[PDB]
């Protein structure tokens with residue numbers, strides 16, 4: 001029998017509906033306690049940090065419980081006088097680089113049937129020429145009816161679709177994973193029988209341990225992907241068949257003593273590989289910063305065979321230099337790229353990129369964090385993006401995120417691990433091939449009530465620009481978009497008009513779910529944008545952005561950093577409600593059913 005201590009997992013189902021990159025997850029688990037005693041049951045799964053929980057329901061023999069979303073402050077008032085912290089008590093916590101762990105332990109009645117259902121949503125982001133859907137599969141028992149169903153609907157059409165299950169042998173995956181796509185519709189169905197779940201023909205344990213990955217991309221022949229539905233729009237921009245731009249890239253590398261060991265080795269290895277794949281038309285230099293600041297050439301040099309080999313030799317040879325002069329290192333790298341303005345104007349049409357890697361905070365020279373931010377942004381002056389890589393967890397990552405945000409870039413975390421070299425290569429490949437610069441998506445001011453970031457410094461091959469917004473009443477029919485940008489010595493310009501007939505056709509094919517997901521796509525991107533914006537503004541404007549993010553989280557019912565989801569009707573030993581939160585970037589209690597709470 002599958003059951004353990006009288007408890008068996010009758011069914012465990014993951015249902016993912018993807019509509020124009022908006023991914024709607026529903027995970028449903030039904031556990032049955034056949035024992036005549038009380039038994040403890042678990043609902044335990046991993047979800048991506050990028051997603052927002054939107055609903056949670058528990059039904060025990062008709063007794064229904066639902067997560068009520070509210071201001072986080074209100075939800076955590078029960079923790080103030082309590083012996084446990086909300087972080088320790090919460091059902092959700094960080095469990096890895098990109099995933100969070102949702103865990104609840106519940107004492108169920110005898111002869112009981114309990115159904116758990118968790119809903120979470122995200123907008124899939126394109127990277128490396130694909131979208132990726134990752135589902136952590138790990139039932140701590142065999143499941144009678146296990147299913148993963150992914151239903152994809154893309155107006156532009158699906159160009160490719162794949163489904164990989166690492167934990168399954170190639171022969172088992174073939175018979176068990178059903179996938180197909182035609183036109184706008186794609187489907188993946190994974191329905192392993194109990195026999196197919198056992199690791200061995202006559203062993204009790206289940207091989208369903210690992211990750212179920214679904215990847216796809218949409219046809220990009222049609223340069224215009226403007227999707228309008230019920231006063232909300234989503235605009236996807238990723239032109240194909242563009243010529244790679246030549247680029248000027250400077251690497252600013254921390255060589256402080258703390259880098260000693262694996263970090264410097266993995267950093268050097270990544271630089272060697274990056275230099276090895278550089279294209280002849282690019283220009284580059286290298287900057288090292290410890291206590292002293294050091295540049296390989298002091299100016300942008302061409303990526304010739306000799307220069308690349310000399311740079312690789314310089315990478316292999318350098319040694320560490322104690323402290324960390326981050327201000328000097330960045331300003332030096334910026335000075336080199338800015339030579340293109342006066343000394344080297346023949347490189348001015350290239351796309352410029354500045355990448356910085358550090359494992360610690362500034363200890364030499366300018367150490368006032370606010371001053372460094374000022375120094376950097378005043379030197380770059382919006383000419384090129386800055387990509388900060390935080391190596392390990394001794395860096396002030398918020399400091400790195402703000403700096404990149406203030407300079408048309410983003411920050412990325414590098415985890416100290418056996419694959420740090422691949423992480424660095426992985427990130428660089430996202431910015432390695434600029435195709436357009438100064439992308440300006442323009443929409444008629446008379447029609448737009450709200451909109452997301454519409455200016456983007458660089459567009460890279462393999463990635464994508466997405467804009468969403470809300471349309472004013474009676475302006476949807478004539479809605480349009482103009483996209484301007486520059487290539488290397490070229491001007492880019494297109495116009496996208498709503499295809500009214502096509503929208504109605506799409507609405508018929510996908511149903512009213514299309515309207516809802518486009519709006520919720522806008523809400524998701526707007527909330528994320530508010531969370532990003534709030535971190536780089538003064539405390540007064542930060543409160544204003546927070547209130548916008550709070551109100552939108554409540555309106556659309558998202559569990560975000562400003563909201564929590566509480567479950568009335570359950571209590572731990574101290575009478576505390578289950579609480580669900582969004583953990584931040586920086587002892588397992590068990591619950592019982594309790595219908596009473598002290599009256600106010």
Ligand SMILES: [Mg+2]
Pocket residue numbers: 254256257258259324359360361
């Ligand atoms: Mg350091």
